Amino acid sequence: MLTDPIADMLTRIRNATRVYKESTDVPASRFKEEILRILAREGFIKGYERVDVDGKPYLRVYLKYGPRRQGPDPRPEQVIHHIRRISKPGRRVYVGVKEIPRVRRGLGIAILSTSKGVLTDREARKLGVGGELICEVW
Amino acid sequence: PTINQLVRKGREKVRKKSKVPALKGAPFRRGVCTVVRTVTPKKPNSALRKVAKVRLTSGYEVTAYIPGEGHNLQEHSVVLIRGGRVKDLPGVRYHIVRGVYDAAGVKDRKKSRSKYGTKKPKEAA
């Protein structure tokens, strides 16, 4: 089935990030490779590779965490706080130069797919090329 | 309503009703009148409040109230159809003003002389 394996991925991400499981798998595609590329490239996930399950190409992602605090329960804090799919298959966003997010007023990242490949906020802004606003993460 | 359904139909705008149709954009109308009576507010009151029927100058029999204590009015006055109900007289919309073409406020008033007629208490001393 699927209607955006992309969003289902970002979702499985949210899953792992919340349930705290060192890694999680998500099927093979160029675009997701680009995404996870961005993620690892900005100190978020823990890495990825072209794997296989049952004879079916997949793409697994290992993900980051932080230190274990005391007091209010042992729960260690998160690095990949949250991600939201912005340009849904109905919200086909088409940002450009003067546009483009500023994600948590400073930090964050705008993941956007443009004329020349998959660029981030500061990136695509610097490149002076825009396109679809994939998702947001911080 | 998934973007699509919102695009096709839409989300209809509030739309008022004017809970005070003195109408014409006119909130001051030339209150003729008929009847006086009394009536009462809910559970713990009892007073007077007229009913001034006014006819405005375009329709409506309303129930024009008054500015309270100190009236004469009889049956014309030009009760200036105003606007504002209370927990009394199931109407109290479109009040009366004093000064207008009749009433000129309470015989001796020291505050609400912005409706209650009385000019400038020039007690000559």
């Binding site: - | 003729v32 008929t34 029927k53 006819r55 009889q74 049956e75 014309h76």
Partner: protein
């Protein structure tokens, strides 16, 4: 019908505002605004101007009178409300003597307890229904 009435009130709205004189004042006890003035031919011709160029259909009537009334004798009856209903009753056996007096005095009743029967909450209320059953003879 009183629809033509406030209409004729506009008529006055240019009658009692052109010729000072007359007084268009309504008797309290009865309806109908009294057109008062100083002259037979006065009111007659003002009335001419009415059906003439203001055209009003009002069968020009005789002025009514403020009728009151009373009695002429001492009466004693039983005001017994021997009526239970749901259990709450609300019953009242009142025993009044009534006395009448001169055309011009005023209104009188007396704090008249035979000793101390009827509650003192009725003293300012048992007379009300007396004063109440008096607005209509």
């Amino acid at each position: 019908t009183k629809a033509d009435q406030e209409k004729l009130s506009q008529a006055l709205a240019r009658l009692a505002e052109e010729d000072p004189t007359f007084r268009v004042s309504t008797h309290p006890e009865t309806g109908q605004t009294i057109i008062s003035g100083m002259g037979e031919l006065h009111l007659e011709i003002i009335v001419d101007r009415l059906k003439r160029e203001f055209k009003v259909d009002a069968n020009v009537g005789k002025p009514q009178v403020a009728y009151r009334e009373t009695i002429t004798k001492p009466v004693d009856v039983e005001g017994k409300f021997i009526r239970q209903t749901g259990g709450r009753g609300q019953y009242g056996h009142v025993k009044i003597k009534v006395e009448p007096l001169p055309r011009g005095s005023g209104f009188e009743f007396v704090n008249a307890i035979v000793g101390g029967v009827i509650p003192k909450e009725y003293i300012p209320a048992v007379q009300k229904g007396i004063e109440e059953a008096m607005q209509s003879g």
